[PDB]
Amino acid sequence: STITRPIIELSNTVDKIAEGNLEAEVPHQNRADEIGILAKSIERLRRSLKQQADDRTLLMAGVSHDLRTPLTRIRLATEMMSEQDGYLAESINKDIEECNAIIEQFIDYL
Amino acid sequence: STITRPIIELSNTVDKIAEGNLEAEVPHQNRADEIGILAKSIERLRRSLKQLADDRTLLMAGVSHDLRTPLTRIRLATEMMSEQDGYLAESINKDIEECNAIIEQFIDYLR
């Protein structure tokens, strides 16, 4: 058959997408028939997944940058505290570092 | 040909997945031919995306809960700060509130 191969090729294309490959070219889009339509569909899935990974990435960088400011300001604030409040400053400093590790872990995961 | 419908049906299944629908059944998996292989493929893509969305949801609930303890402990330490250090206490709570908004905003664009 000649329809056999296009279907097997698109199955492989889905496989690669599933695997996380969002760059691989979707073949057979320029067909007028139902095979061409299935390809175009797969290409819409892919384009959409690529877009969504791209906005996740930029979002991530955004929250990373946006969270540093206040978290840094709080550490700086503990460096202004009086001697009397040293005991509290070290408690706060410890919890800020904790917050940082929690965030940094979660970006590496998401 | 009598292969036409199954192909269109699977193109529709793809469309739904692209749309965000991860629950809709992938038809024609129990076919012995290429069509059944393509379906099974699409089902592996779906299963996997469902799994990723599940991981992400759990992960966020995790971080939201994990952040709350140190943040709350910070706020309570500021409440012990001397009258002298009032100005600093206020700035540290302002910043804790800012962190909460930023995190809460970021959880919301994801799911």
UniProtKB/Swiss-Prot annotation, chain A:
Q: Which residues bind ATP?
A: H65
Q: Where does the source fall among the domains of life?
A: Bacteria
PTM section of the record: Autophosphorylated. Incubation of isolated EnvZ C-terminal fragment (residues 180-450) with increasing levels of NaCl or sucrose increases its autophosphorylation.
Knockout-associated phenotype: No expression of OmpC or OmpF during growth at 0% sucrose, low expression of OmpF at 15% sucrose. Single deletion of envZ has no OmpC or OmpF at 0% sucrose, low levels of OmpC and very low levels of OmpF at 15% sucrose. Deletion of both ompR and envZ leads to loss of both OmpC and OmpF expression at 0% and 15% sucrose.
Q: Where is this region: Cytoplasmic dimerization domain (CDD), when dimerized forms osmosensitive core?
A: 51-110
Record note on what altering R56A does: Autophosphorylation by cytoplasmic dimerization domain (CDD) is resistant to waldiomycin
Q: Where in the cell is it found?
A: Cell inner membrane
Q: Which residues carry this modification: Phosphohistidine?
A: H65
Specify the inducers.
Part of the ompR-envZ operon.
Phenotype upon changing P70A? Autophosphorylation by CDD is resistant to waldiomycin, CDD peptide probably no longer binds waldiomycin, alters structure
The impact of changing H65R is: Does not autophosphorylate, does not dephosphorylate OmpR in vitro, no OmpC or OmpF at 0% sucrose, low levels of OmpC and very low levels of OmpF at 15% sucrose
Coiled coil start-end: none
Miscellaneous section = Cross talk between this and the Che and Ntr two-component systems can occur at least in vitro.
SUBUNIT field: Homodimer. Interacts with MzrA.
Q: What does this protein do?
A: Member of the two-component regulatory system EnvZ/OmpR involved in osmoregulation (particularly of genes ompF and ompC) as well as other genes. EnvZ functions as a membrane-associated protein kinase that phosphorylates OmpR in response to environmental signals; at low osmolarity OmpR activates ompF transcription, while at high osmolarity it represses ompF and activates ompC transcription. Also dephosphorylates OmpR in the presence of ATP.
What the entry says about domains is: The periplasmic domain interacts with MzrA. The periplasmic domain assumes a PDC sensor fold. The HAMP domain by itself is intrinsically disordered. The cytoplasmic dimerization domain (CDD, residues 223-289) forms an osmosensitive core; increasing osmolarity stabilizes this segment, enhancing its autophosphorylation rate and consequently, downstream phosphotransfer to OmpR and signaling. The autophosphorylation activity of the CDD is inhibited by the angucycline antibiotic waldiomycin which probably binds to it.
What protein does this entry describe?
A: Sensor histidine kinase EnvZ
Provide the taxonomic classification.
Bacteria, Pseudomonadati, Pseudomonadota, Gammaproteobacteria, Enterobacterales
